[PDB]
Amino acid sequence: EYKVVLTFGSPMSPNANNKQTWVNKPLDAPSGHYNVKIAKDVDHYLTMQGFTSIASVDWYTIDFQPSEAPAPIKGLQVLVNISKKADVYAVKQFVTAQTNNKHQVTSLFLVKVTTGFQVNNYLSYFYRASATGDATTNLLVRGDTYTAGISFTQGGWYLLTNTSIVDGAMPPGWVWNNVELKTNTAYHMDKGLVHLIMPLPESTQMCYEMLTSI
Amino acid sequence: EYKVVLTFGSPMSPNANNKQTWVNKPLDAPSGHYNVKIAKDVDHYLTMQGFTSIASVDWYTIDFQPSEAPAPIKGLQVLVNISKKADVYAVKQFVTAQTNNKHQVTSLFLVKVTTGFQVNNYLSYFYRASATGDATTNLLVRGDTYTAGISFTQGGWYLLTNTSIVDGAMPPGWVWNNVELKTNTAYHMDKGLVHLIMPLPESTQMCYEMLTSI
């Protein structure tokens, strides 16, 4: 286990400092294109939603003493179609009980790209309508998608996310349920989503406690 | 200067895990009530907007070595009307250039309450409308306010925020411009706002580099 300090880079196109954060929404992609998947094997993988460039990474022990970067996690891969494009160095899940029967799971993967690539994906964003009075108004994902290209550069660090909503029974450890972003379903905030409302300014630092194994 | 790790408590009423974060919006308060102000003197103060309970604080040097908590910052006060309700232990501003002529300044104050108190304030929340296509849709503050009570407990740590939008010329160091949350004006995200969309789960940790002087 490590304490990991990420220094955020500039937003990845089509994102911008003054725009809503676009994330991949579905479990499919346009014709001729592919999702980015973070996979343990063919039956256990999560589809990339959030994509964020990380300028640098500082590694520490769990009590904050300085450490050299670990080696890649064996047996995890960032895949496009059937080819591995990045190594995974650290992982973390945030599990939130919205209710006992509705859990939100946000998975974060710190990855380093080994073959540069681009994908066209169906993108959307979080939004929240104004409402009158003290009524609850939900954090939602826009239904419509905007098809756009996303580019990943060799040698770059990236932070990838996936958020699932799991109904009913939960498994006991790492959750592999792969669920597209829902529209019409309330999300909560968790520490894995704080960078996905609008891009945080380049040079912003965030600290996470992360694992180097599933 | 310190690296400060905050462990978030439960949301403060009227907030909840499943609700938008309510923040104080204006520079005034209902009849018979008062804003919370974080003041250096009568001509230099910021009005509380965000209010968040912090369960615990861990203090480190700038390179992450463990440290005892500092003493309160002399000459800063958390005031209600004309009475000091809390000591300020650490401060930080995030300054964002939306454009060269529109800067966003988010100030964070880590405080410990010394006399418990309650205020009724005019509250609002951040929202973002759905829009079609790849149009930018702004992060805004709802115009309408909801009047509600906010309670602060003796001995508790709290994180207070203020965000200003400054038009034109900027001062060179700590910005004392006190500006209510605007409606109809785009906000960006900064590291001081990441906990103010919806409450982060109790026990979430966030790390900040903070000062113990202005």
Numbering used by the authors:
A (entry chain A), B (entry chain A): 431 to 644
Question: From the publication, what sentences describe this entry?
Answer:
Human astroviruses (HAstVs) are nonenveloped, positive-sense, single-stranded RNA viruses that are a leading cause of viral gastroenteritis. HAstV particles display T=3 icosahedral symmetry formed by 180 copies of the capsid protein (CP), which undergoes proteolytic maturation to generate infectious HAstV particles. The AstV CP is composed of several domains, including a highly basic N-terminal domain, a core domain, a spike domain, and a C-terminal acidic domain. To further explore the structural features of the AstV CP, we determined the crystal structures of the HAstV-1 CP core and spike domains to 2.60-Å and 0.95-Å resolutions, respectively.
The HAstV-1 CP spike, composed of residues 429 to 645, was expressed in E. coli and purified. The HAstV-1 CP spike exhibited an apparent molecular mass of ∼50 kDa as examined by gel filtration chromatography, consistent with dimer formation. The purified HAstV-1 CP spike was crystallized in the space group P41212, and a native diffraction data set was collected to 0.95-Å resolution. The previously determined structure of the HAstV-8 CP spike was used as a molecular replacement model. Structural alignment of the HAstV-1 and HAstV-8 CP spike dimer structures by the DaliLite server revealed nearly identical structures, with an RMSD of 0.8 Å. One noteworthy difference was an unexpected disulfide bond formed at the interface between the two protomers of the HAstV-1 CP spike dimer, despite the presence of reducing agents throughout protein purification. Sequence alignments of the HAstV-1 to -8 capsid proteins revealed that this disulfide bond is unique to serotype HAstV-1. Consistent with previous studies with monoclonal antibodies, we found that the HAstV CP spike is antigenic. We mapped these sites in the context of our immature and mature HAstV models and found that the P site lies on the most outward side of the virus and is exposed in both immature and mature HAstV. In contrast, both the S site and the β-turn lie on the side of the spike and are sterically hindered by other spikes on immature HAstV.
